[PDB]
Every structure is written in structure tokens, then in C-alpha cells.
Design a protein around this nucleic acid. Structure first.
Length: 49
DNA sequence: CCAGATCGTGCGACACACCGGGCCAATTGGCCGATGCCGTCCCGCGAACCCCTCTACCGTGTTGAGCAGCAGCGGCCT
């Protein structure tokens, strides 16, 4: 857990990660899975990454 | 004006300067010689330490991209 301050701890939760066991690895993602789809509106923040 | 500080000079004392004598104190420091406790070693036995061996109802299966070489096949050529 990341405990610099209340905001950092809260933002450690509410995090969606696309890489891990069963996901896609860091070096393999193209440039289409790293884009802001127009369906992100209200489901995933386009600024905070 | 003239009298003590400074110094000259003088007499003595005198603290040693000598360089040579003639004995001594302190203080030895060696181990001398004699006595005694510890290191080393050679067993002595025993606890453990590691290796080898055998047991016979029977039981039968584990991403993308780039570049290059090989196998199968269409189709001439004889």
C-alpha cells in the first residue's frame, strides 16, 4: 500500500490495471490499447495515468 | 652649590674549576640451585555415525516485425 497521504492511499484503490497474471505484458501492448476510446466517458479517467 | 648612582678599585669570601686521588653507599641481576604444577600424548572404553543388506497375500501406462530454410504441389520435359 502507498501511504504518502490520504489522497495517495485512496487513489491506490480505485485503480484499474491492464497487466498482470492473465493479462497483457508491458512490452507487448500495441498503440491501440494505450488510447482513449470514446467509450471511456464516465468509466475511466483519461487524464490520470 | 653638592650628594647618591655609577663605576673604579680593593679586600675578602667563596662557589666552585681544575684534574687527580682513595675509598664507599645504593643497587644490583643473573638465574645457582631446589621445588612444584601444567601440556602433551597414549591408550581405554564407549556413544554415535555412516554404510550395507533384506521383506514373498498382491500389485503391471506420464506480439510484431524481419529474415531464412524445408516440405508439398502445379506444371513442363523427356
Amino acid at each position: 500500500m502507498d501511504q504518502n497521504n490520504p489522497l495517495s492511499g485512496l487513489t491506490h484503490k480505485r485503480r484499474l490495471s491492464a497487466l498482470g497474471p492473465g493479462g497483457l505484458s508491458r512490452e507487448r501492448a500495441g498503440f491501440e490499447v494505450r488510447d482513449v476510446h470514446p467509450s471511456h466517458y464516465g468509466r475511466m479517467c483519461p487524464i490520470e495515468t
